Amino acid sequence: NLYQFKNMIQCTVPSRSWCDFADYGCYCGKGGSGTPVDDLDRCCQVHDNCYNEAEKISGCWPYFKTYSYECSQGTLTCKGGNNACAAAVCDCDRLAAICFAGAPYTDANYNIDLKARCQ
């Protein structure tokens, strides 16, 4: 669920407030449309596409699905016991939090005009 994804970001990018990733580019912090603006926005495009794919599983709602995962000593682990939906959504979130860690953050891309730039 999103609360869990917020915590994953806090796990991999503790130098940034989680909120920096909540409204960035065309894809970070919504469903997403148009052309990703940079590397970090591409993390988010893949994250969003990953959620769209997980939505094909019956009863699977990525924003709301509570999975089982661990954050400790700089490492994210999606745990055994996750059903197909949980395991899919957890992996979406885990792969995204890692991507965020290695991607540059450009302040100009925070809170851009989605209607004009993301068509």
Distance CA 47, CA 94 (A): 9
- Three-state SS string across 91-103, please? HHHHHHHHHHHHC
Catalytic residue numbers? 47, 93
The percent of the chain in helix, strand and coil, each rounded to the nearest 5, is 50, 10, 45
Determine if residue 110 is left, alpha or beta; phi over 0 gives left, psi from -120 to 50 gives alpha, anything else beta: beta
Handedness of CA 103, 107, 112, 117 (dihedral sign): negative
Is the CB of residue 43 less than 8 Å from the CB of residue 96?
yes
Please state how this structure was obtained: X-ray
Distance CA 38, CA 19 (A): 18
In our burial notation (b when 16+ CB lie closer than 10 A, e otherwise), range 15-34 reads eeeeebbeebbbbbbeebeb
Resolution in A: 2.2
Q: Which CATH architecture has domain 1-119?
A: Up-down Bundle (1.20)
Q: Is 31 annotated as a binding residue?
A: yes
Distance CA 98, CA 40 (A): 11
Q: Is 23 annotated as a binding residue?
A: no
Q: Is 27 annotated as a binding residue?
A: yes
